[PDB]
Design a protein around this ligand. Structure first.
Ligand SMILES: *[C@](=O)([C]([N]C(=O)[C]1[C][C][C]N1C(=O)[C]([N]C(=O)C1=[C][C]=C(C(=O)[N][C]C([O])=O)[C]=[C]1)[C]([C])[C])[C]([C])[C])C(F)(F)F
Ligand SMILES: [Ca+2]
Length: 240
């Protein structure tokens, strides 16, 4: 997250770090949100790959012992059936990951709240991204959870030619696009927390930003619109 600030240890307790085996040690590669105690929501393209995955909940500094961490393996990856690795811009960039045992909840570990199916935000909605991704284009990972105020840019505006054109669709959400603050690599798969009727809920999963760079004016960070995939989520979880 470029242009962020570091978050307080207990603000965003559904935040997770998704990591791989890197071999001898582990390496953050994306974010995720805790949505059940044995289930996490992240982006299909962060689990595209043949690596071993773990998840870390109660994580504030990726280095440094926090005193609050729980580390749990991933048992089972369900990618959207229509995701195609070649095409982030088609959408479906969404995956659920079954953990090997359920985490315990506390003040640093909590379940993400999901929007009602179908909800769409007004323009210029209040929303935060959070993550450990690069703090500059072609920079380095934060060591501490960062967060950045990114309000929404609605589908017609984000849709216009001066912004994403065509490449956005309506199964997606745009937020930011001011030139200063944005998502960046290593924030992929994590939450976009929006304020709606006094409670924060997770309305996006971080997907993509532009090839010219992370914080570019008029190319907002783009995310999977959670509210288009409610029924898919609940059907996976039901099934396993
Ligand atoms: C994540 O932290 C990171 N996301 C990405 O890395 C994603 C993964 C796939 C490519 N990603 C991009 O964000 C890249 N985007 C593009 O290269 C790109 C932009 C736009 C389009 C498009 O307009 N197609 C339209 C059409 O009409 O079909 C395609 C491709 C950028 C340059 C890096 C953060 C950036 C969120 C992680 F890094 F892990 F992946
Ligand atoms: Ca730590």
């Amino acid at each position: 997250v470029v242009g962020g600030t570091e978050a307080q240890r207990n603000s965003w307790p559904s935040q997770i770090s998704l990591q791989y085996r890197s071999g001898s040690s582990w390496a953050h590669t994306c974010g995720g949100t805790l949505i059940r105690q044995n289930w996490v929501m992240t982006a299909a393209h962060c689990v595209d790959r043949e690596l071993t995955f773990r998840v870390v909940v109660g994580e504030h500094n990726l280095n440094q012992n926090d005193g609050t961490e729980q580390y749990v393996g991933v048992q089972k990856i369900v990618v959207h059936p229509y995701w195609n690795t070649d095409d982030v811009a088609a959408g479906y960039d969404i995956a659920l990951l079954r953990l090997a045992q359920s985490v315990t909840l506390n003040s640093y570990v909590q379940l993400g709240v999901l929007p009602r199916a179908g909800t769409i935000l007004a323009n210029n909605s209040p929303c935060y991204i959070t993550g450990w991704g690069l703090t500059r284009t072609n920079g380095q990972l934060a060591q501490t959870l960062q967060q950045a105020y990114l309000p929404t840019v609605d589908y017609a505006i984000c849709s216009s030619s001066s912004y994403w054109g065509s490449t956005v669709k309506n199964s997606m959400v745009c937020a930011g696009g001011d030139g200063v603050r944005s998502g960046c690599q290593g924030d992929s798969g994590g939450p976009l927390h929006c304020l709606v009727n006094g409670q924060y809920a997770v309305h996006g999963v971080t997907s993509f930003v532009s090839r010219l760079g992370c914080n570019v004016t008029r190319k907002p960070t783009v995310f999977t619109r959670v509210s288009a995939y409610i029924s898919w989520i609940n059907n996976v979880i039901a099934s396993n």
